[PDB]
Amino acid sequence: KMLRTYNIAWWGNNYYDVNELGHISVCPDPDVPEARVDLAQLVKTREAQGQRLPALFCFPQILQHRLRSINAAFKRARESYGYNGDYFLVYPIKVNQHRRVIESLIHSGEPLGLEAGSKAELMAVLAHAGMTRSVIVCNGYKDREYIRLALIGEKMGHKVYLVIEKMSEIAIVLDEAERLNVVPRLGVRARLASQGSGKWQSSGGEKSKFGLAATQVLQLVETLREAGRLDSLQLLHFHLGSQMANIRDIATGVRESARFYVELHKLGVNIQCFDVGGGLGVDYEGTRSQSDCSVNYGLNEYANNIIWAIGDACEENGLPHPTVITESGRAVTAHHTVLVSNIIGVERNEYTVPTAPAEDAPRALQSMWETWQEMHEPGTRRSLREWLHDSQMDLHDIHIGYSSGIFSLQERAWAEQLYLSMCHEVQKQLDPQNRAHRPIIDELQERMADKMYVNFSLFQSMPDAWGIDQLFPVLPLEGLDQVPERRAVLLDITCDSDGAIDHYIDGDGIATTMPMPEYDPENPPMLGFFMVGAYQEILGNMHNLFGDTEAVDVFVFPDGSVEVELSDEGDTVADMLQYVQLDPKTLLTQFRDQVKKTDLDAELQQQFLEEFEAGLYGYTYLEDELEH
Amino acid sequence: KMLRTYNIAWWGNNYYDVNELGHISVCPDPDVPEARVDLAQLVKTREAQGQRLPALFCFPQILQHRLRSINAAFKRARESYGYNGDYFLVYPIKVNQHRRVIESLIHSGEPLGLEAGSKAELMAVLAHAGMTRSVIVCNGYKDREYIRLALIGEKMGHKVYLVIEKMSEIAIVLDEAERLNVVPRLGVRARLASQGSGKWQSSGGEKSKFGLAATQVLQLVETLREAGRLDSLQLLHFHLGSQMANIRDIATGVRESARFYVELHKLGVNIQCFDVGGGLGVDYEGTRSQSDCSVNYGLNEYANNIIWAIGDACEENGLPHPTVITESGRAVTAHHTVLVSNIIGVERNEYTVPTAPAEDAPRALQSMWETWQEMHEPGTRRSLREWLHDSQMDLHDIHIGYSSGIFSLQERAWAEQLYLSMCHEVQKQLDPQNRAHRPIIDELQERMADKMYVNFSLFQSMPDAWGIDQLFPVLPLEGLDQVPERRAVLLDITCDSDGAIDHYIDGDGIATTMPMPEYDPENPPMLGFFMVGAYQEILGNMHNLFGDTEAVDVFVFPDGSVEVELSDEGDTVADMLQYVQLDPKTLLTQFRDQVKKTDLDAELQQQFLEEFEAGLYGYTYLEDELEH
């Protein structure tokens, strides 16, 4: 029932699933369902083989399959409607610039383009591109340097589209086009009034980054008429934003932007490209709803909505079907990487039968003991709801009273334990079928859950979980077959209390606590963080000087073999000290001296520069210590 | 009135202020009020001298003065009460590890310590420390390697305190203490029940990072009794969190934690250190209230509350006054650095007298024009509230109607402009004294504000403004003397619409728009972001591959001279491409080849590797282009 309460089947998209052994297995390519891998086994294997603690396992095969899937979805819709236009995805580097992603996509069989949101990204795109004539599209604020490079990429051979997202831009691109003597290939991004909040305006106090207002789109078409270059403007672009929860928001977005296609044609411009610009959401929770981190529409539904919109739009006015482009970055990168780490220590409560308090102790403590004895004796069993309220209030009195200076620490420590024992007892008697026992059964699972510490940095590995309440499915890599025997809250090894997971997946909705299988506190399992593929890897900050986690690319062939090559090095203490300008080399020698004036033997004096230098050039994270 | 609506006088703490010239000047050391600097002039100076665009100006003199101020505040209270204990601040590297901060503090006259929240930070602390016996305190999750290093620092000479924040830790420190044969100097961090939410428990599902439960504190004292080392435990620690808005939360925090001091003494332990652990807030808004980004208590008030608590606590039970330690990181670093950048472009609306629509145009447009003509003619002037509602609804009809395909883009562009003209007109007639004209005067300032684009990355320079709605005072470096002539919303050059400032300082409260002085849109002023000192610099992420901004240390002597030495290099496109594994060198040559097959002259073919290599090893940000 635990694989059902985690919704693995739903957000897993057939890539992840619990094998016939309780362990979570992964099938990087669901086209060959027999090519699976015991993720838990693979971890243990690499673990005992010398693998670094917090690791990032990536299955580039998923990137490719995912890409092939959306293309298939748009194909399943192009034919079903009768659309005569082509369709290809244009991955926006923004969501992940990592070589692995850019490459896995390029080196696939499906046709795709690359979008750059800045001059720096354009550079990286041109890099990955190579001598292969690839399609590139440039967005973001543009200046001379950027417009130039863009134009230089066009003259280079590459079919690069320069999206006009600000009137003042068209002036520059044109001038620089003559200076470099190159025929500009550019597109336009129009503001939409569909959202509904003054997003249509181009100068309003509304926080709408780019886009051309209705009047400015006409001025662009007019300016291109003067320089006789309407043939240049050939791409239409609009972005509704990332993670579009509600499908209607999208329909209302293409419906409108689609009229810009026809209205622009009536003015003469051609435009063979209709760029719906990403927006396609990814179900993170696993309930497939209209919530925050979840979409209420499937892959096909999205495709249909898109094609049909531009479709009927053309038919009506008798126009040719343009090439449909999309920039669903998050959509493809989403679940191709899993963060995996270990439990470095746990805080399980210790149930101990309480002993009568000092005969001459405060009444508050006598009261708590009076209630305890009353539980253990044939009286009333439903009166437990009351006994609870009793212990809670007495504990509160001695607590507030402790600060007042009218209760000893020994007394407070005593009361606290009796109360924790009171819970452990009431939690047993509790009846799950009784309506008055359910609001408490949930209250106790909280005040009785384990507090485990995972070997990672939330700010480094899942920053989106900080800036936004980004929900990421977190679960143990094994024992997913049995029923939850206890709850637990998990927090990272950051000294900041803000480093922990707030909400967890729990079937119907999200709970403040995470359900865990019966595990040995002396030897806990590994933890897996999924859907942590987009906007994550290269966007974390070194909180307590914790650097990049190590990453590995895992492959699974129909053959049955499994390749696992290194993908990322992983920062070391030394790397971090370089950032804050310290230089490890000069720091080593400074230690070499202080240790000579140790006045201690040469035996120990040297095994210290070993310990020091070891940790100096060693991983940034912690080592598993037996303090669970 | 603009220097009053920005509250500069309040959050400026005499460091920042508008000089007798409209420009914002800075006095890094208010002990010498005649040592000021025209910040706007300094920027322009360095600007025309070749300084990089987005720059970070830091006045290390402020760090020192700030430190001297809090020490003075605690001194003003130690005597006033009659406290016989010493007091010194212990700066937690966590809030800023940058050499400049660590150094400026160390190289000051005031006594201070350093706190490390991880093994990596401990390394950096030991580094900055040097051969100068300094006080160090270790926090955060600890493992062998970390505990060792800590102990090795004690044997080294440094007085390093190892804070016990988890029962399982005391086992290790003890064992490693014998292995390294060193007498351990450690402190303990106890959980408090003051907060009120089960934070007192050590294993609850509550997200409380570290701390020892009442029972565990007794077990620690007991374990140290067996190994006969109660003399080792000599530091008491508690952390209420960062930015404590309400002063009462603090009083209630020391009051309780103070009893742990006395209760622990009764058991025999000594404890000469009372660490209240940071928490001291900084007023960011400038209203000095109990809001989110603002405290309701001054420097002295905090000091008093602290000393008095531990004070009376001792007197009562007849105990000696312990050394009072605090870790107010944010408190000292807060305002010693200002982010400064330029406006790369603005979006001001263009008022143009509308022309009658096509005689055979839809009624909706006829309706908008009908209302326009009615405004320009001796009829009713208070009926403007109505005319507004009229234009709004007609514009909405043609808008929704445009998507329906029953309105041409020419018509939509027309209506939009007539409406924008309608506003510009109604905004003039509007009466500020009329009660029914104020709810609109605010509605128009929004839909008529300038949209300017600042040359920076919110995610790189002020990440805290993303993960939390961190308010930072943003204002122009000049023209602060005059009255706001227009409002404006400012957004960064990130292609993501989430890159902008949501709220701005506006006297009483925060507004969604920022008030700007009458400026030339062709030649705008510089912008300054203040209070951006803690948790900022080294904690931003390269969103669109935008690297670290450049930083400079500015000095101002009583002499009148101003020194401005370089502090940080500032990433270049090349640096960024290294991160995503690309290597610029091998990328240069790949271009060298594609340009040889350009089939174009050698004149242009070479001025391209110039342009390319220039931007490749050039700053990461954009260049000021005349598109404002």
**B179 burial level (CB within 10 Å; 0-12, 13-18, 19+):** exposed
Distance, in Å, from the CA atom of B85 to the CA atom of B68, rounded to the nearest integer, reads 18
Answer yes or no: are the C-beta atoms of B118 and A545 closer than 8 Å.
yes
Distance, in Å, from the CA atom of A303 to the CA atom of B350, rounded to the nearest integer, reads 39
Give B322's DSSP letter: P
Answer yes or no: are the C-beta atoms of A55 and A342 closer than 8 Å.
no
Distance, in Å, from the CA atom of B623 to the CA atom of B625, rounded to the nearest integer, reads 6
The radius of gyration of chain A's CA atoms, rounded to the nearest angstrom, is 30
Give A455's DSSP letter: S
β pairing state of B486-492 and B514-516: antiparallel
CB hemisphere CA count around A329 (13 angstroms): 22
Answer yes or no: are the C-beta atoms of B165 and B210 closer than 8 Å.
yes
Query: What's the per-residue H, E or C state across B232-300?
Result: CEEEEECCCCCCCCCHHHHHHHHHHHHHHHHHHHCCCCCCCEEECCCCCCCCCCCCCCCCCCCCCCCHH
CA–CA distances in Å: residue A15 to residues A60, A383, A480, A537, B499 = 12, 49, 16, 20, 34
Length of chain B: 628
One-letter amino acid for residue B414 of the chain:
W
Residue B497 in tokens: 């619409």
Answer yes or no: are the C-beta atoms of A116 and A137 closer than 8 Å.
yes
Answer yes or no: are the C-beta atoms of B459 and B466 closer than 8 Å.
yes
Of B223, B224, B259, B221, the C-alpha closest to B238 is B259
Answer yes or no: are the C-beta atoms of B193 and B202 closer than 8 Å.
no
Domains within chain A, CATH numbers bracketed? 1-59+337-352+449-571 (2.40.37.10), 60-336 (3.20.20.10), 353-448 (1.20.58.930), 572-628 (1.10.287.3440)
Answer yes or no: are the C-beta atoms of A135 and A272 closer than 8 Å.
no
Answer yes or no: are the C-beta atoms of B77 and B64 closer than 8 Å.
no
**A544 burial level (CB within 10 Å; 0-12, 13-18, 19+):** buried
Give B491's DSSP letter: E
- At residue B391's C-alpha, the angle toward residues B389 and B396, to 5°, is 95
Non-local (6+) Cβ contacts of A542 within 8 A are A460, A571, A576, A579, B538, B539
Give A322's DSSP letter: P
Distance, in Å, from the CA atom of B122 to the CA atom of B146, rounded to the nearest integer, reads 8
Query: Are the beta carbons of B205 and A117 separated by less than 8 Å?
Result: no
Give A350's DSSP letter: -
> CB distance from B318 to chain A under 8 Å?
no
Distance, in Å, from the CA atom of A488 to the CA atom of A486, rounded to the nearest integer, reads 7
Answer yes or no: are the C-beta atoms of B100 and B58 closer than 8 Å.
yes
Phi, psi of B403 (to 5 degrees): -70, -30
CB hemisphere CA count around A471 (13 angstroms): 23
Residue B312 in tokens: 């009376």
Place of tokens 């039968």: A353
**A12 burial level (CB within 10 Å; 0-12, 13-18, 19+):** buried
DSSP lists the bridge partners of residue A58 as: A337, A553
Distance, in Å, from the CA atom of B399 to the CA atom of B406, rounded to the nearest integer, reads 10
Answer yes or no: are the C-beta atoms of A282 and A332 closer than 8 Å.
no
Calculate the CA B528 to chain-centre distance: 12
CA–CA distances in Å: residue B37 to residues A376, B27, B34, B337, B565 = 77, 6, 9, 14, 15
CA–CA distances in Å: residue A423 to residues A351, A368, A371, B5 = 10, 12, 12, 55
Tell me the three state secondary structure of residue A236. Answer: strand
- Chain B contacts in chain A segment 55-94 (CB below 8 A): 94
Number of H helices, E strands in chain A: 20, 22
Distance, in Å, from the CA atom of A119 to the CA atom of B573, rounded to the nearest integer, reads 8
Distance, in Å, from the CA atom of A307 to the CA atom of A328, rounded to the nearest integer, reads 15
Distance between start and end Cα atoms, chain A: 27
Answer yes or no: are the C-beta atoms of B27 and B434 closer than 8 Å.
no
Give the E-state strand segments of B52-158 in sequence order: 55-58, 87-92, 112-116, 135-138
Tell me the three state secondary structure of residue B307. Answer: helix
A625 Rama class: left (phi>0) / alpha (psi -120 to 50) / beta: beta
Non-local (6+) Cβ contacts of B124 within 8 A are A545, A576, A577, A580, A582, B93, B97, B102, B116
Give B598's DSSP letter: G
Answer yes or no: are the C-beta atoms of B390 and B367 closer than 8 Å.
yes
CA–CA distances in Å: residue B464 to residues A292, B8, B454, B535 = 22, 21, 18, 7
CB hemisphere CA count around B214 (13 angstroms): 28
State how far residue B25 is from chain A, nearest Cα, in angstroms: 29
β pairing state of B24-26 and B135-138: unpaired
Tell me the three state secondary structure of residue B619. Answer: strand
Calculate the CA B115 to chain-centre distance: 21
Distance, in Å, from the CA atom of B149 to the CA atom of B537, rounded to the nearest integer, reads 27
CA–CA distances in Å: residue B173 to residues A378, B40, B232 = 48, 54, 11
Place of tokens 């919110």: B458
The verdict on whether residue B302 carries a ligand-binding annotation is no
Length of chain A: 628
Query: Are the beta carbons of B598 and A241 separated by less than 8 Å?
Result: no
What crossing angle do the helices spanning A384-403 and A363-375 adopt, rounded to 10°?
Answer: 160
Answer yes or no: are the C-beta atoms of B531 and B332 closer than 8 Å.
no
b/e burial code for range B583-598 (CB count within 10 A of at least 16 → b): ebeebeeebeebbeee
Q: What is the DSSP string of A60-103?
A: HHHHHHHHHHHHHHHHHHHHHHT--S-EEEEEEGGG---HHHHH
Residue B387 in tokens: 């005319």
Distance, in Å, from the CA atom of A27 to the CA atom of A61, rounded to the nearest integer, reads 9
Widest CA span in chain A: 101
Tell me the three state secondary structure of residue B303. Answer: helix
Distance, in Å, from the CA atom of B448 to the CA atom of B489, rounded to the nearest integer, reads 10
Write down the H helix ranges in A93-155. Answer: 99-106, 119-129, 144-155
Distance, in Å, from the CA atom of B538 to the CA atom of B551, rounded to the nearest integer, reads 12
Query: What's the per-residue H, E or C state across A128-180?
Result: HHCCCCCEEEECCCCCHHHHHHHHHHHHCCCEEEEEECCHHHHHHHHHHHHHC
**B603 burial level (CB within 10 Å; 0-12, 13-18, 19+):** exposed
DSSP lists the bridge partners of residue A135 as: A159
Of B511, B502, B504, the C-alpha closest to B475 is B504
Phi, psi of B42 (to 5 degrees): -60, -40
CA–CA distances in Å: residue A345 to residues A450, B210, B617 = 10, 12, 46
Answer yes or no: are the C-beta atoms of B321 and B84 closer than 8 Å.
yes
Non-local (6+) Cβ contacts of A490 within 8 A are A451, A452, A453, A454, A474, A500, A501, A514, A527
Place of tokens 């506190």: A521
Tell me the three state secondary structure of residue A32. Answer: coil
Residue of A nearest to B101 (CA): A580
> CB distance from B327 to chain A under 8 Å?
no
Site from B52, B53, B131, B207 to mutate, A interface, most A CB atoms within 10 angstroms:
B207
Query: What's the per-residue H, E or C state across B499-567?
Result: CECCCEEECCEEECCEEECCCCCCCCCEEEECCCCCCCHHHCCCCCCCCCCEEEEEEECCCCCEEEEEE
Tell me the three state secondary structure of residue A347. Answer: strand
Query: Are the beta carbons of A145 and B500 separated by less than 8 Å?
Result: no
> CB distance from B543 to chain A under 8 Å?
yes
CB hemisphere CA count around B93 (13 angstroms): 34
Residue B376 in tokens: 């320009």
Of B331, B312, B311, the C-alpha closest to B322 is B311
Of B263, B275, B274, B276, the C-alpha closest to B322 is B274
* Documented resolution in Å: 3.1
Q: What is the DSSP string of B439-492?
A: HHHHHHHHTT-EEEEESS-HHHH-THHHHS-----EEESS-TTS---EEEEEEE
Phi, psi of B490 (to 5 degrees): -115, 130
Distance, in Å, from the CA atom of A215 to the CA atom of A211, rounded to the nearest integer, reads 12
Residue A527 in tokens: 């933890």
b/e burial code for range B461-485 (CB count within 10 A of at least 16 → b): bbbbbbbeebbbbbbbbbbbeeebe
Residues of A in contact with B573 (CB under 8 A): 119-120, 123
> CB distance from B420 to chain A under 8 Å?
yes
Answer yes or no: are the C-beta atoms of B314 and B83 closer than 8 Å.
no
Calculate the CA A542 to chain-centre distance: 17
- At residue B231's C-alpha, the angle toward residues B227 and B237, to 5°, is 110
Give B341's DSSP letter: E
Non-local (6+) Cβ contacts of B107 within 8 A are none
Q: What is the DSSP string of A503-571?
A: -EEETTEEESSEEE-S--TTS--EEEE-S--SS-GGG---TTS--PPEEEEEEE-TTS-EEEEEEE---
Answer yes or no: are the C-beta atoms of A417 and A365 closer than 8 Å.
no
State how far residue A59 is from chain B, nearest Cα, in angstroms: 18
Residues of A in contact with B118 (CB under 8 A): 493-495, 544-546
> CB distance from B447 to chain A under 8 Å?
yes
Give A260's DSSP letter: H
Distance between start and end Cα atoms, chain B: 27
> CB distance from B495 to chain A under 8 Å?
yes
Distance, in Å, from the CA atom of A40 to the CA atom of A38, rounded to the nearest integer, reads 6
Place of tokens 């009120």: B196
Residue A85 in tokens: 């236009």
Distance, in Å, from the CA atom of A171 to the CA atom of A155, rounded to the nearest integer, reads 19
Tell me the three state secondary structure of residue B40. Answer: helix
The radius of gyration of chain B's CA atoms, rounded to the nearest angstrom, is 30
**A109 burial level (CB within 10 Å; 0-12, 13-18, 19+):** exposed
Site from A203, A314, A333 to mutate, B interface, most B CB atoms within 10 angstroms:
A203
| Nearest Cβ partner for B94 among A448, A495, A590 | A495
β pairing state of A450-454 and A486-492: parallel
Other C-beta atoms closer than 10 Å to the C-beta of A33 total 11
Non-local (6+) Cβ contacts of A559 within 8 A are none
Widest CA span in chain B: 101
Residue B222 in tokens: 């007991």
Distance, in Å, from the CA atom of A621 to the CA atom of A431, rounded to the nearest integer, reads 44
